[PDB]
């Protein structure tokens, strides 16, 4: 029995890398971007069910490594393209945490929680990033309201101070291309629009139109200033 | 196990190593012809294929680079920096082989993240060579300036080297 548990644990660690295993097969749901992993039947059904708590982690890890694959495939210049690079960096910090178990598989013993306390720091990032992904599913992201949606999601999440700090890192790195065009427009008067990353658009009189979709994290009165 | 760790370096250095892979393009997918083995080696050696497929496209670009200095002073000086970025890939191969001999674990999963950081370096070089299949000096400056208008100073720094060196 425990050797059959151990090779299922190693199959599980490949699934969290983001790659297909041997006994854990991958079933496409929307194009295998929301991966419903399905393991075969086990002689002990319980240890199979402990793995069932862990396949949503690689499901949500597959949603955000393909979210940052999608926004760079259309070469978006907006601030969501810089938000996803933090997700690429948080995904790179993901893969070093898995390789500690590969170092532990040299000499070391797995337990039911030796899995869990590695997975629960990452299933908490998964459930935060899945709440990021479902707001994307409702319809967004253009530049100024990418910051607005991220501002809503941080002010919603207030109360769990552990991942409040990582969503602080997301909402301030996404604003880093935007606070360029703050400084270029309020101190020089020049504009850069790859698609458009700032709400103020041209068109003597020569009036301007603010768009009613690129409003920043705060409300309209500082945006008119 | 270890023979597959040796097999990835030879495709990282160029064309196929232990076995034949018969794929110039679209990725240099690795065939071992074995069924009784696990189904989780073909996918890792498909990650090692896209790193080696994208390597040989840079090397064949430097083979087409050879001119007296034909139809542009900008065109091969673009590739002079691309040989510098080809050179940076080789030093990252020099850390891998020193892991292989005896003098860490020789597993396929650890070297995946050691190649995942070149995967953000090399794949944005693939966008830089796709944009200029047919090209002329002066129009190269309109290629790299369209790549610096994107944000994210990860490859925006890398195209700013090319912007400062195409313009030179």
């Amino acid at each position: 029995l425990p050797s059959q548990e151990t090779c299922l644990v190693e199959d599980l660690l490949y699934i969290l890398i983001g790659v297909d295993g041997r006994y854990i097969s991958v079933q496409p749901l929307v194009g295998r971007q929301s991966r419903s992993f399905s393991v075969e039947q086990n002689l002990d059904s319980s240890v199979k069910e402990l793995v069932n708590r862990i396949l949503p982690v690689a499901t949500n890890y597959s949603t955000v490594t393909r979210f940052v694959e999608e926004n760079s495939s259309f070469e978006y210049g907006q601030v969501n393209h810089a938000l996803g690079a933090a997700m690429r960096t948080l995904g790179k910090e993901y893969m070093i945490l898995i390789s500690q178990l590969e170092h532990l598989q040299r000499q070391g013993l797995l337990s039911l929680q030796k899995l869990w306390f590695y997975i629960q720091p990452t299933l908490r990032t998964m459930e935060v990033l899945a709440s990021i992904a479902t707001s994307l599913n409702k319809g967004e992201c253009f530049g100024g309201a990418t910051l607005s949606l991220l501002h809503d999601r941080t002010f919603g999440y207030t109360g769990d101070s552990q991942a409040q700090e990582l969503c602080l890192y997301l909402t301030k790195a996404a604003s880093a291309p935007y606070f360029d065009i703050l400084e270029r427009w309020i101190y020089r008067g020049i504009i850069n629009d790859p698609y458009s990353e700032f709400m103020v658009e041209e068109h003597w009189d020569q009036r301007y139109t603010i768009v009613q979709q690129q409003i920043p994290s705060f409300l309209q009165k500082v945006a008119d200033k | 196990e270890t023979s597959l760790v040796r097999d990835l370096l030879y495709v990282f250095q160029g064309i196929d190593g232990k076995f034949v892979k018969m794929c110039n393009s679209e990725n240099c997918y690795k065939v071992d012809g074995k069924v009784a083995v696990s189904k989780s080696l073909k996918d890792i050696t498909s990650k090692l294929s896209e790193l080696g497929w994208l390597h040989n496209k840079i090397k064949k670009y430097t083979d087409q680079r050879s001119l007296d200095r034909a139809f542009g002073l900008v065109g091969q000086s673009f590739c002079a920096a691309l040989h510098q970025e080809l050179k940076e890939y080789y030093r990252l191969l020099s850390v891998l082989h020193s892991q292989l001999q005896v003098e860490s674990s020789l597993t396929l999963r650890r070297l995946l993240v050691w190649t995942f950081d070149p995967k953000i370096r090399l794949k944005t070089l693939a966008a830089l060579v796709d944009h200029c299949q047919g090209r002329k000096g002066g129009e190269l400056a309109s290629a790299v300036h369209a790549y610096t208008k994107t944000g994210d100073p990860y490859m925006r720094s890398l195209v700013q080297h090319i912007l400062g060196l195409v313009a030179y």
């Binding site: 070093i96 390789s99 500690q100 170092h103 | 860490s104 674990s105 650890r110």
Partner: peptide, 15 residues
């Protein structure tokens, strides 16, 4: 090896 890789990423973040 894992502690050396974390220090190798710290030198890459400074440069």
């Amino acid at each position: 090896a894992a502690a050396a890789a974390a220090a190798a990423a710290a030198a890459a973040a400074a440069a």
